[PDB]
C-alpha cells in the first residue's frame, strides 16, 4: 500500500505537466524537510521509461532499491519480478541438460 501511495504522489505531480527536474528538486527539498513519501524515493528518476525506484527495508536498517513501473500496479510489478525469476529457472534447467554432453 505505501508503494501505491508513492506512485499516486508521483503520478499526481506528473499529471500537473510539471518539469521532471523541478519534480526531482521537489523530492530533494521534501527529503530535507522530512517527508516520508519523499524519503522512500531514490533520486535518479527514470521518468523517460515511466519507472521510479523505491527503498524498502530488508528487515521488518538495510534498505534495497526496487524499480517500479508507474503504469502497472505494485502487485503487477511484483508479478513481473516473479516472472523474471521463473524465466531464469528454465534457462538453468536447459544448462543442466547441456552439462553432460557439453563436458563430454
Amino acid at each position: 500500500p505505501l508503494i501505491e501511495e508513492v506512485k499516486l504522489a508521483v503520478q499526481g505531480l506528473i499529471d500537473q505537466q510539471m518539469d521532471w527536474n523541478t519534480i526531482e528538486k521537489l523530492i530533494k527539498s521534501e527529503q530535507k524537510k522530512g517527508n516520508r513519501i519523499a524519503q522512500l524515493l531514490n533520486l535518479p528518476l527514470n521518468l523517460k521509461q515511466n519507472k521510479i525506484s523505491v527503498k524498502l527495508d530488508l528487515s521488518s536498517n538495510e534498505k534495497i532499491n526496487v524499480t517500479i513501473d508507474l503504469g502497472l500496479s505494485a502487485y503487477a510489478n511484483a508479478t513481473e519480478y516473479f516472472n523474471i525469476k521463473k524465466t531464469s529457472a528454465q534457462k538453468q534447467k536447459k544448462v543442466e541438460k547441456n552439462v553432460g554432453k557439453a563436458m563430454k
Binding site: 499526481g12 523541478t22 521537489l26 527539498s29
Partner: protein
C-alpha cells in the same frame, strides 16, 4: 483545464509565508498554485492569465500581468471575478513574481496587489497577513525604481496617513520576521533560481540581492518596533546565527558595496540595541567576518571599495568601545589585518575617511592599540605626502586636505614630543608651498583656516619676498 494533485504537499502541512491554507514560498519548485483551485476561478479569462504567468518566458508573463491589471482597473465590472479563490492563487504566484529578475515584472506585481487592496478594502482582511509582508519587502528593495513607486502607492492606498504605514510595521511584525527567516535560513541560492537556466554566478547574485532586501527590512522593523527584540528573540537568534547574512560581507567579489553597507548598518543597529552585546556568539561571528573583510580590500579594488571604507572604520570604532577593545582580541591577527587595511586605504582617500581614522584612534588610544610614534605617525606622514602630490588635482581635494589637517592636528596634540611638532610644521609648509592653488580656492583656504601662530606665517611671507 488544470490537472493533477499536489499530494506531496498535503503531508507537509507547512504553509511557509501563507497563513490561509496555501503554501506561499519563494522557491520555484513549490508553492505553485494547486490545480484544483485554479479550476475554481470565476472566469475563463482569469484562468488563462494564470497559465501564462506560469510559463517561463518573460514576454508572456508580462503580457499576462498587463492584462490582469487592465481587469483590475475596470474594477466595477469585474468585481465578481476577484474572489477569495483569486486572492489565494494570486498570493502564491505573487511571491514568486517579486523575486523575478525582470524589474517590470516586479513593479507590475506590486502595483497590482496594491490596487487589489484599495479596491477590495475590508475584504482582503483575511489575506492581509499574506500580502502585507511581501508588499513591504518590495518597498525595501535596494533598487530605487522598484522601491519608491511601491512606497508611494502604499501610502496612497492608506490615504496618505503616516500612522497607518507605521502601524503596519507594528501589526505584522511577527509575519515580517517570518519572511526574513525564510529568505535567510530556509532558502539557498539553488532553491531561489533554477540551475539549468542559470550559472553558478547570477544564482549567487540573485540570492544576495534578495537577502539584502531582507536585511534592509529587518533594520526597518527594528527601528519601527521598540519591543521587537524581546518578543521575537528566538526567531531573531536563528536568523542572526545563520552565516548567510554574514556571507554578504565579502568585498573581494560582487557588483556593489551597497549590500555590504546594509549588513554594516545591521551590526551597528544591533549594537545600539544591545542585542549583539547580549548574545556573544552572534557578535563574535559578525566581528570576525568584518575583520576578514578588511583583508579583502586590495589595490586592485580600492577605487571600487572606497565609498564604503569610512563606514567600516566607524563601525569598528564603536565596536572597539565594547569590552575594552574586545573585538580586536577575538582575532589573533586582527592587528595585522588593521595595519594592512590602513596601508591599502591610505593610498586612496575618500571624503570622511580621515575622520573615521581619527575616531578609531580615539577609541584605541586608551588601550594602546597602535604605537603613537613607531606605528601611527608613519601612517600620517605618508598620507600627507601622497595628498600633496596628487594635489589639488582632485575635486574634494579641498575638503579632503582640510580634513587631514583638522584630524592630524588633533593627533599631534596628544604627543608632547619634538618630532611630532617638527613634522607638523614641516609638512604644513610643504603642503602649502608645493600646493597647487590653495589660496585660489577660497573655500579650501577658508576650510584650512590656519596651522600655526599668526605672526610666524607673516615672517615666512617675509622670506618669500626676501628670497632670490
Amino acid at each position: 483545464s488544470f490537472g493533477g494533485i499536489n499530494t506531496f504537499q498535503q503531508y507537509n502541512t507547512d504553509l511557509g509565508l501563507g497563513h490561509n491554507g496555501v503554501r506561499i514560498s519563494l522557491n520555484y519548485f513549490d508553492g505553485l498554485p494547486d490545480p484544483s483551485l485554479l479550476n475554481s476561478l470565476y472566469s475563463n479569462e482569469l484562468k488563462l492569465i494564470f497559465k501564462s504567468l506560469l510559463k517561463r518566458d518573460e514576454t508572456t508573463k508580462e503580457k499576462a500581468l498587463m492584462d490582469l491589471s487592465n481587469l483590475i482597473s475596470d474594477f466595477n465590472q469585474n468585481e465578481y471575478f476577484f474572489n477569495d479563490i483569486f486572492l489565494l492563487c494570486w498570493s502564491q504566484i505573487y511571491a514568486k513574481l517579486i523575486i523575478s529578475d525582470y524589474k517590470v515584472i516586479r513593479l507590475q506585481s506590486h502595483q497590482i496587489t496594491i490596487m487589489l487592496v484599495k479596491s477590495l478594502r475590508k475584504k482582503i482582511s483575511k489575506f492581509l497577513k499574506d500580502f502585507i509582508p511581501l508588499i513591504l519587502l518590495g518597498t525595501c528593495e535596494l533598487d530605487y525604481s522598484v522601491s519608491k513607486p511601491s512606497l508611494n502607492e502604499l501610502t496612497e492606498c492608506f490615504n496618505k496617513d503616516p500612522a497607518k504605514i507605521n502601524a503596519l510595521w507594528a501589526v505584522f511584525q511577527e509575519q515580517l520576521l517570518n519572511l526574513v527567516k525564510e529568505i535567510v535560513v530556509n532558502e539557498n541560492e539553488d532553491t531561489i533560481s533554477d540551475e539549468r537556466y542559470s550559472s553558478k554566478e547570477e544564482s549567487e547574485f540573485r540570492y544576495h540581492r534578495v537577502i539584502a532586501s531582507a536585511v534592509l527590512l529587518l533594520i526597518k522593523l527594528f527601528v519601527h518596533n521598540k519591543d521587537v527584540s524581546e518578543r521575537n528573540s528566538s526567531s531573531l537568534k536563528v536568523i542572526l546565527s545563520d552565516e548567510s547574512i554574514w556571507k554578504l560581507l565579502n568585498l573581494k567579489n560582487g557588483q556593489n558595496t551597497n549590500a555590504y553597507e546594509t549588513v554594516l548598518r545591521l551590526i551597528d543597529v544591533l549594537y545600539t540595541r544591545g542585542y549583539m552585546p547580549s548574545h556573544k556568539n552572534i557578535m563574535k561571528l559578525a566581528v570576525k567576518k568584518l575583520l576578514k573583510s578588511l583583508t579583502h580590500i586590495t589595490s586592485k579594488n580600492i577605487l571600487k571599495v572606497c565609498p564604503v571604507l569610512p563606514s567600516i572604520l566607524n563601525l569598528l570604532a564603536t565596536l572597539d568601545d565594547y569590552e575594552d577593545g574586545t573585538i580586536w582580541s577575538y582575532d589573533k591577527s586582527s592587528k595585522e589585518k588593521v595595519l594592512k587595511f590602513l596601508s591599502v586605504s591610505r593610498t586612496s582617500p575618500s571624503p570622511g575617511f580621515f575622520n573615521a581614522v581619527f575616531a578609531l584612534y580615539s577609541s584605541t588610544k586608551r588601550h594602546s592599540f597602535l604605537d603613537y610614534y613607531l606605528e601611527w605617525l608613519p601612517f600620517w606622514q605618508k598620507s600627507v605626502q601622497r595628498l600633496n602630490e596628487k594635489g589639488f588635482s582632485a575635486r574634494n581635494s579641498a575638503e579632503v586636505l582640510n580634513e587631514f589637517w583638522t584630524n592630524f592636528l588633533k593627533f599631534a596634540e596628544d604627543s608632547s614630543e619634538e618630532r611630532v611638532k617638527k613634522m607638523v610644521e614641516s609638512e604644513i609648509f610643504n603642503s602649502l608651498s608645493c600646493g597647487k592653488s590653495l589660496s585660489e580656492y577660497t573655500k579650501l583656504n577658508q576650510t584650512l583656516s590656519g596651522v600655526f601662530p599668526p605672526d610666524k606665517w607673516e615672517r615666512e611671507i617675509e622670506d618669500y619676498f626676501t628670497s632670490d
